[PDB]
Amino acid sequence: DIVLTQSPLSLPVTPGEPASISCRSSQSLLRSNGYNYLDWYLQKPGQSPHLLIYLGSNRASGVPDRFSGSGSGTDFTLKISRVEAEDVGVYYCMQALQTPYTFGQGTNLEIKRTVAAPSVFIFPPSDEQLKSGTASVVCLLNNFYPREAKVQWKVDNALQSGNSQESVTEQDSKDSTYSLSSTLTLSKADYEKHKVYACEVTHQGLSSPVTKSFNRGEC
Amino acid sequence: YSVLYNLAPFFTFKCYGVSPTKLNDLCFTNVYADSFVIRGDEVRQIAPGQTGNIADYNYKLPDDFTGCVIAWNSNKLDSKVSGNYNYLYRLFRKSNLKPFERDISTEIYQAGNKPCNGVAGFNCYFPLRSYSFRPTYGVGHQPYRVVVLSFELLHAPATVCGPKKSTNLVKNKCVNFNFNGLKGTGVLTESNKKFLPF
Amino acid sequence: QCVNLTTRTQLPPAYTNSFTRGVYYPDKVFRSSVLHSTQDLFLPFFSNVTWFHVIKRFDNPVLPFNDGVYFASIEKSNIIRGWIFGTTLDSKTQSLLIVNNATNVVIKVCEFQFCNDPFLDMESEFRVYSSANNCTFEYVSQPFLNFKNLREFVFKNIDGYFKIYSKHTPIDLPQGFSALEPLVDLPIGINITRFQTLLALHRSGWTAGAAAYYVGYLQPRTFLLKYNENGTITDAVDCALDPLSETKCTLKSFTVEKGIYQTSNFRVQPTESIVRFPNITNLCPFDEVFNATRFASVYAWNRKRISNCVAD
Amino acid sequence: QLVESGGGLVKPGGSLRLSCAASGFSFITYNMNWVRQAPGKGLEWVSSISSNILSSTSYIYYADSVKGRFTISRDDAANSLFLQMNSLRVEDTAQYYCARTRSRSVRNCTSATCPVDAFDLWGQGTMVIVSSASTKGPSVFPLAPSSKSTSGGTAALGCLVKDYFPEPVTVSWNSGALTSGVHTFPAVLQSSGLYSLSSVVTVPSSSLGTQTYICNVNHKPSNTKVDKKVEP
Ligand SMILES: *[C@@H]1O[C@H](CO)[C@@H](O)[C@H](O)[C@H]1NC(C)=O
Ligand SMILES: *[C@@H]1O[C@H](CO)[C@@H](O)[C@H](O)[C@H]1NC(C)=O
Ligand SMILES: *[C@@H]1O[C@H](CO)[C@@H](O)[C@H](O)[C@H]1NC(C)=O
Ligand SMILES: *[C@@H]1O[C@H](CO)[C@@H](O)[C@H](O)[C@H]1NC(C)=O
Ligand SMILES: *[C@@H]1O[C@H](CO)[C@@H](O)[C@H](O)[C@H]1NC(C)=O
Ligand SMILES: *[C@@H]1O[C@H](CO)[C@@H](O)[C@H](O)[C@H]1NC(C)=O
C-alpha cells in the first residue's frame, strides 16, 4: 500500500526554538496538475482533528502565520516560529493521490519548562478493596511538565509489566502543568504473596529518579 | 384562472404583457411553466430587459416575453427553525447567460491570472452562493416563490382553448343564436334526426 | 435491444385489386338522402395495391409515403399490432409511434432510435426502440381492437392534422361496401415521408400466424358519395374511372336515362419543356452604374440605355 | 457538524445505524467522507461519497474491506448521513468523523482516484463498543490522605471509583464548595473493559481533625449517586 513512517516524534522542543517534523513519500505526489497535493492536520486531543496547512504552500482556515510548509516531491518539512501552550496535539501528513489512503504516526507536542518539579503520590489499597479481592494501588504525578514520564512498578526487585495503565490529564489553563495517574491492578492472592510495593518516576526535570517505597499492612 | 388566483397568499401580480381580463378568453399553445424560489426583493430582477445578478448570470429574460410572471410570498413552507441553506444561485460567471437557456455547469471561476484545477484558493471561488431563509428575517430576505408563464404561437394547432366556463343556451322561441362561435339567425328547435358519434 | 431475423425468405411483393375500398367520410358533416360531390384525397376504384402475406414469410418493408396511406388487413388472433411513421426513422428526426398492448393504445411521437428489424413478441416483450431524446407529447386512448375480422385504416397528414379513419367489420379483398368513420385527430403538425409495420411473433424459436395486410395509394380526385335516409353512406362513384360514372357524376344521379350526354373536354397534356435563348451572352457592367464613385444630382439625372446583355 | 447520533452496545451479528446532525449549511454541495480513529497512533478512513449537485449519479470510492462490509447512503433532502453495517467482524472502537471536504468543485476524478483538498468539519460525540456486556454500577473506595508529597502541613486525599459503565461520570468534592487543590484525572480502558477513574484534592493538615470531606460521585446513564466520606 502507501503506509509510511513519519518523524520519530521523540523530539525535545523548547520555547524559542523551531520544531521541524518531516514525513517522506514512497512515490511521487504528482497527479493531474502540478500542485503539491499534501496536507497537514493539527489533531489537538479532546475535541477534533483540525487542520493547519492545506495543499500547496498557502494558508487557509485562519491558521496563525507561525506554521508554514515547504518542500516538494520526496522532501517535505514544517517550520514553527515559536511553540505555544495551545499547539499540543498529534501530527499527521495527508496525501491527496487517492481516496484509499493510509495514516501515519503522531505524538503530542513536548515543551521543556525544566522548572516544575514533579510531585509523586502513592496510595495504598483500602481494606474494602482487599475484602473485594482486588488490590488497586495508584501512583500519581502532580505539577510536572511535560507529559512524558517513565513510570514503572517494582515488586520484590522485579519489574512489572502488563498490569499498569497510565492516564495523562490535559494542560491546565492556570499554571500550565500536566498530571499523570498510574493505576496498578493485582489479585488479592498475589498481593498477600509479596511484601513491598512501590512506583518509580523518571522525568527530565530530575537529576535522579524519585523512588518511594511503602509496605502493605500499615494503617 | 379562478383556482390558482384569489387565494390567501399575497399575489404580486404586477406584470406587463397579456391582459388579466383577456386570460379567460385566450387560447395559447405550449405554455412553459417554470417555478423557482428567491430571497426578498429579487422579484424585480425577473423582468424583460432587466439588468441584475439573477438577470445576467442565473435567469436572463429576452427582449420579448409575450406574457408576464406570477409571484407570491411564503414564509412558512420555505423556512425552518434552524438555517435553511438548501437553495443556491450562481454568482460568478465569465460570459453572459443566453436567454431562455439553462447551463448547469458548476466549475471554478478563473477570476485571476493563475488558473485553479478544482481547488479554490485566493483568486478562485465557487460561483454558487446559498440563500438565507429564516422566519425572523425582514421583507428584503423573505423567501419568495415566483412562477413564470410564457405564451406563444407554435406549429401545434389550437387544442388548449377549452370550455372556458361558457354558461348559455335557451329554448327555441324563434331566437337568433350563435353556433359554435359562429352567429346564427335560425331557431334551436328539437330534432328527430339521428347523428353519428363523430 | 434489437434482434435481427435471418429466417426471412426473399419473395417479390404481390398485387391485388381495390374494387370497393378506400371510401371514408370527408368531414363530420351530417348528410341524408343526398348525392354530394366533393374533392378529397381518395383511393381510386379498381386500382392495383400491394399485397403482403405473413405466415415462414415475414414482410416488414420500407417505402416512402408523403401522405395518404391506406392500410387494410384481414386479421385473426391479433397478429398486427402497430405502425411507424417518420422521415428518416432515427434519432435525428421526429417519429410517430403506434403501439397497443392488451390494455389500451399508446401514441408517442418522439425522436426514437430505430433498429433494422423492429417487431413485437403471453406477450410481455417490447423490443422496438432504445432511447428517446426530443419530445414532449403523449396520448393514450381507448383500445381499437379461418378469416373472421377486417381492419381498415386511413392516415392523412393535411394542415398539420393526423386524420385517422377506422372501420372493423365481421367477415383477397371482400366484395362489399363500408364507410371508414373518423376515429381520432392528432394535432402533431410534423413531417412524415416513410412508414414501417410492426409485427407480433408468437413464442412456443418463434412462430408466426397467417396474416395479410394491404397497402394502397391515395390520389386527389372527386367522388359522388350517397347518403341514405338515416345517415350512413350507401355507395360511392368515382368521377374519372369510366365514362358511365363520369355521366353519373355530371348528372348528379346514380341512374342515367337513354340519350347523349356531354361531360368534359378531351385535352392533350404537354410532354417536354422547350425554352432556349440566343446562346450569346453579353452581360452588363451593372457595377459601373451601381457602384459608381459619382452620382448625378436630382435636377439633372444621368440616363443610360443599357442594351444587349443579361440580367444577372 | 455539532452532534452525531448513533451509539451504544451492538452485537457482532447485529446492525448499526449512524446518522449526522448539524446546523444550517450548504450541505448538498460537499462530498463528505468518513474517518475513523484509534486510541494509539494511526487513524483510519472508512468511506467517501460525492454530492449530487456536481454529478448526476455521483461518485463511489471504496476500499476492499469497507466494500465487503460497510455501506453508505445519502438523502439529498435533509442534514443527515447514513452509514449502515449489515455485518461486523472486528470493530472495537469507532468514532466515524463526519467531516466534509474543502472542494466545492470536482475535476478529473474517476471511479477509483480523486484528490481531496482538506477536511475542516470533523465531528465527534458518538462511540460504539461491541461485547461490552451491560451497564454496571460504580464502586467508590476512599483513599486515606498521605502527608508526604504535600509535606506535613498539607494532605492529599481522594475518592477512587471502579467498575463503572460508561465513560461519562461526575465527581465533586463537598458538593462543589471545595475548589482548591481538586484535580480530576481521565479514566483508562482496562483489559476486562470496565473503566476506573481517580480524583484527589489537597487540603491543609490542620483541617483534617475538624472538617469532614465527602466526595459525590454521580453517574447519569446508570442513575447512581454515591456520597462517600474520606477519613484518615
Ligand atoms: C398491377 O399494378 C401495376 C403497377 O405496379 C399495373 O401496371 C398493373 O396494370 C396492375 N394490374 C392490374 C390487373 O390492374
Ligand atoms: C401497456 O402499455 C402501457 C404503456 O407503457 C403500460 O403503461 C401498461 O402497463 C401496459 N400494460 C401491460 C399489461 O403491460
Ligand atoms: C429539439 O431539441 C432542441 C434543443 O433541446 C429544441 O430547441 C427543439 O425545440 C426540440 N425539437 C422539438 C420538435 O421540440
Ligand atoms: C419532409 O421531409 C422530406 C425529406 O425528409 C422533404 O423532402 C420534404 O420537403 C419535407 N416536407 C416538409 C413540409 O418539410
Ligand atoms: C335508421 O337509423 C338507425 C340508426 O341511425 C339504424 O339502426 C336503422 O337501421 C335505420 N333505419 C333503416 C330502415 O335502415
Ligand atoms: C462595388 O463594385 C465594385 C465592382 O466589383 C467592387 O470592386 C467594389 O468593391 C464594390 N463596392 C464598393 C464600395 O465600391
Could you tell me which residues of chain B have a Cβ less than 8 Å from any Cβ in chain A?
117, 119, 121-122
C-alpha cell at C103: 390494455
The position carrying cell 393514450 is C140
- Rounded Cα gap, residues C232 and C159, in angstroms: 27
Give the angle A123-A127-A132 at the CA atoms, nearest 5°: 110
- Structural contact between residues C167 and C181, judged by C-beta atoms closer than 8 angstroms: yes
- Structural contact between residues B156 and B30, judged by C-beta atoms closer than 8 angstroms: yes
Expressed in angstroms, the distance from the first to the final Cα of chain B is 30
Which residue has its alpha carbon closest to ligand 5 atom 10?
C230
CB contact under 8 A, D103 and B82: no
Tell me whether residue A92 is exposed, middle or buried, using C-beta atoms within 10 angstroms of its C-beta: 0 to 12, 13 to 18, 19 or more.
Answer: buried
Indicate which atom in ligand 4 lies nearest the CA of residue C191.
1
Mutate to test the interface with B, among C24, C30, C166, C191 (most CBs of B within 10 A): C30
- Rounded Cα gap, residues D165 and D132, in angstroms: 9
Q: Which helix (H) or strand (E) holds A191?
A: helix A188-192
The dihedral through the CA atoms of A202, A208, A210, A211 has a sign that is: positive
The closest of B86, A48, B137, B76 to D24, measured between CA atoms, is B86
The position carrying cell 410517430 is C96
The H helix count followed by the E strand count for chain D is 1, 15
Parallel, antiparallel, or unpaired: how do β-strands D183-184 and D195-204 relate? antiparallel
SS3 (DSSP) at B42: helix
Which residue has its alpha carbon closest to ligand 3 atom 10?
C134
Q: How far is the CA of C134 from the centre of ligand 3 (A)?
A: 6
The closest of D160, D197, D191, D162 to A162, measured between CA atoms, is D191
- Structural contact between residues D21 and D123, judged by C-beta atoms closer than 8 angstroms: no
Which listed CATH number (2.60.40.420, 2.60.40.10, 3.90.1640.30, 3.40.50.150) goes with A119-215? Answer: 2.60.40.10
The closest of D166, D91, D124, D133 to D6, measured between CA atoms, is D124
Determine phi and psi for B122, rounding to 5 degrees: -105, -40
The one-letter amino acid code at A99 reads T
Q: Which helix (H) or strand (E) holds B40?
A: none
- Rounded Cα gap, residues C295 and C71, in angstroms: 69
Closest Cα in chain B to D53: B106
All domains of chain D in start order, with CATH: 2-130 (2.60.40.10), 139-229 (2.60.40.10)
D3 in contact with A, Cβ within 8 Å? no
SS3 (DSSP) at A190: helix
C-alpha cell at B195: 347523428
The closest of B196, D186, B73 to A46, measured between CA atoms, is D186
Resolution of the entry in angstroms: 4.2
The closest of B39, B130, B35 to B89, measured between CA atoms, is B130
Parallel, antiparallel, or unpaired: how do β-strands D128-129 and D8-9 relate? parallel
CB contact under 8 A, A212 and D186: no
- Rounded Cα gap, residues B17 and B67, in angstroms: 5
Whether C and D touch (3+ CB pairs < 8 Å), yes or no: no
CB contact under 8 A, A51 and D119: yes
- Structural contact between residues C30 and C230, judged by C-beta atoms closer than 8 angstroms: no
Give the count of alpha carbons within 13 A of C173, CB side only: 25
The closest of A174, A123, A173 to D155, measured between CA atoms, is A123
Binning chain A into helix, strand and coil, the percentages to the nearest 5 are: 5, 35, 60
The position carrying cell 503522531 is A106
- Rounded Cα gap, residues C111 and C133, in angstroms: 6
The closest of C140, C143, C92, C97 to C118, measured between CA atoms, is C97
Give the count of alpha carbons within 13 A of D138, CB side only: 31
The one-letter amino acid code at B66 reads T
Which residues 25-84 on chain D approach chain B with CB closer than 8 angstroms? 25-29, 53-54
Q: How far is the CA of C180 from the centre of ligand 2 (A)?
A: 28
Tell me whether residue A183 is exposed, middle or buried, using C-beta atoms within 10 angstroms of its C-beta: 0 to 12, 13 to 18, 19 or more.
Answer: buried
- Structural contact between residues A163 and A184, judged by C-beta atoms closer than 8 angstroms: yes
Out of D44, D143, D190, the one facing A103 most closely (by C-beta) is: D44
- Structural contact between residues A185 and A197, judged by C-beta atoms closer than 8 angstroms: no
Does residue C101's CB lie within 6 angstroms of at least one atom of ligand 2? yes
CA A193 from centre of chain:
35
The closest of A17, A13, A93, A23 to A53, measured between CA atoms, is A93
The one-letter amino acid code at C309 reads C
Question: What is the greatest pairwise CA distance in chain C?
Answer: 96
Residues sharing a CB contact under 8 Å with residue C149, sequence separation 6 or more, in sequence order: C74, C75, C76, C168, C169, C170, C171
- Structural contact between residues A12 and A112, judged by C-beta atoms closer than 8 angstroms: yes
The residue to mutate among C101, C120, C129, having the most atoms of ligand 2 within 8 angstroms of its beta carbon, is: C101
Does residue C48's CB lie within 6 angstroms of at least one atom of ligand 1? yes
- Rounded Cα gap, residues C234 and C224, in angstroms: 11
CB contact under 8 A, B106 and D104: yes
Beta bridge partners of B37: B145
Give the angle C176-C178-C180 at the CA atoms, nearest 5°: 150
Determine phi and psi for A81, rounding to 5 degrees: -65, -45
Expressed in angstroms, the distance from the first to the final Cα of chain D is 48
Closest Cα in chain B to C230: B194
The closest of A140, A76, A142, A84 to A109, measured between CA atoms, is A84
Could you tell me which residues of chain C have a Cβ less than 8 Å from any Cβ in chain B?
25, 28, 30, 32, 136, 160-161, 181-182, 187-189, 230-231
- Rounded Cα gap, residues A197 and A193, in angstroms: 11
Residues sharing a CB contact under 8 Å with residue D173, sequence separation 6 or more, in sequence order: D182, D199, D201, D213, D214, D215, D216
E strands present in chain A:
38-44, 48-53, 67-70, 77-80, 90-95, 119-123, 134-144, 150-155, 159-160, 164-168, 178-187, 196-202, 210-215
- Rounded Cα gap, residues B159 and B121, in angstroms: 55
- Structural contact between residues A202 and A151, judged by C-beta atoms closer than 8 angstroms: yes
C-alpha cell at C154: 386511413
Closest Cα in chain A to B117: A33
The closest of C195, C209, C210 to C89, measured between CA atoms, is C195
Q: How far is CA D29 from CA A178, C45, D105, D168, in A?
A: 42, 70, 9, 36
How big is chain A, counted in residues? 219
Q: Which helix (H) or strand (E) holds C243?
A: helix C243-251
Determine phi and psi for B144, rounding to 5 degrees: -115, 135
Beta bridge partners of C82: C198
Q: How far is the CA of C191 from the centre of ligand 4 (A)?
A: 6
Determine phi and psi for A143, rounding to 5 degrees: 60, 50
